[PDB]
Write a protein that binds this ligand. Sequence first.
Ligand code: ATP
Ligand code: MG
Ligand code: MN
Length: 535
Amino acid sequence: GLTPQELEAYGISDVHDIVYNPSYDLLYQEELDPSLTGYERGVLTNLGAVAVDTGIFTGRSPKDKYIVRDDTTRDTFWWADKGKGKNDNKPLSPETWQHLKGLVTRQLSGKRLFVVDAFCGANPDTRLSVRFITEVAWQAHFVKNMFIRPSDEELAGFKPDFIVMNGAKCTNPQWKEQGLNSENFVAFNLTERMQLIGGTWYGGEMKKGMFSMMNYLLPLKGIASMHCSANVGEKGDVAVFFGLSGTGKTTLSTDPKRRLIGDDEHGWDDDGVFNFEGGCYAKTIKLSKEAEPEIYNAIRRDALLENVTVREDGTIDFDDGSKTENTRVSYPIYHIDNIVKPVSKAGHATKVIFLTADAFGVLPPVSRLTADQTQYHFLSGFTAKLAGTERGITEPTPTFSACFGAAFLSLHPTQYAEVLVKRMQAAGAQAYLVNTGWNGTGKRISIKDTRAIIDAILNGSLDNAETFTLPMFNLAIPTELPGVDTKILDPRNTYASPEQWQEKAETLAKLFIDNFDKYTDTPAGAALVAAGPKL
Ligand SMILES: Nc1ncnc2c1ncn2[C@@H]1O[C@H](COP(=O)(O)OP(=O)(O)OP(=O)(O)O)[C@@H](O)[C@H]1O
Ligand SMILES: [Mg+2]
Ligand SMILES: [Mn+2]
């Protein structure tokens, strides 16, 4: 086993108590310690799972994300200040990084620390060995759930490729003088291979931080790194589901008719699709046991609820979004019965689905994309929401996040597109666009109906059917689909008149066109006629 006399070369001193590779049982007792108060304290729910409060931050803080610009990242990273498109990869000086490291290492010094060694990536040949350090038990619990838990043997000869140090309790008072966004920070240094977290307690920063690193390393090696869920059928056929947050990746991949590979982060190499994680991070707002049985059943001892409202009697009010709409629950992947094991990976994907929640109510429930349209929509990374479905009234607001996850991209969008296209062509994969959002009714299509569309896609029903073309976006949609209302197939029918759809389609088309303009600086990018909507 490891010894305390080997964990101070990171700049952490005077650690008297070291809890290495904490067990779920110890994490439980740490979280429910009767004398524990504050944000570290968890509460036991009637479901047997512990629930915690992540504080001020209930989601990621992109504005506080920084990457050190040195000679390791200078000419490879997609920088926020290099006009190559808008992104959160803000350059940080090596000097300021040292200051931040100082804050975090001092905050963790003289404290009882949890050290969790885990893997990011199901394949030994490309996975990262990560060592997580924190003084908060539930943060250690979060990483234990979300990352791949190594075997006793692997832990014996564990050699960290990356170090993640969570100093949530500390803040940076010099941020103004350093030109940073706030007193908080989520910084990355690829030379020292380390991630620092200050101010925010949100565990998600650790999960996506390593995802961001995988997104840097894998594509440069010819391996696609994807923000998608993935599952496989009895026949062995594999599907991947891309989409921005809340579009359905986790909800829809957890499907009774297929084995779950992963719900959020995957790679695609010469052998196939593999999960980067050892757990799932499901959304719990308005959670329905009837609609999502598997996910609900996963909420038990060892799962970790985040920010949900817990009543005096321990019952959970999943509908309460008064604190945040981003209530979550993390759990080891085996909390889902029908998953792929012992290793979360499978063959090449033959079905690539792009999920989008179109608040504009213009995109059809399902359409088959051409090769060029696949690239166009991948780079577009579209989804929409109302200016405030909990704030004001209707006002569809678009979000164009390249590759369906710009916030996690370390390389240029085209680099992800290139590797994805290569893997797709070699596998003869077909792409589909699915609107898990709204139509003319103003009400989101039901999960039941959506699972039916996915069923049709995966079993070939969609491909082996006649289609017509939706104008403006020129999307091929089937005339009918088993277990699906034929009326909704054409979004124009959910409106009192096709004219209403027309006006909104025109607006959305213009948004797409304007958003894509930045990619036309290359001959290939000039592929404006592709999926490219046309007025
Ligand atoms: N037709 C539908 N299809 C999918 N999800 C739906 C549908 N209708 C409502 N929802 C809800 O929308 C949300 C989709 O969330 P999900 O967790 O799948 O997003 P995600 O794509 O996995 O996001 P992230 O990448 O942030 O984890 C869930 O809360 C789900 O209950
Ligand atoms: Mg998800
Ligand atoms: Mn995600």
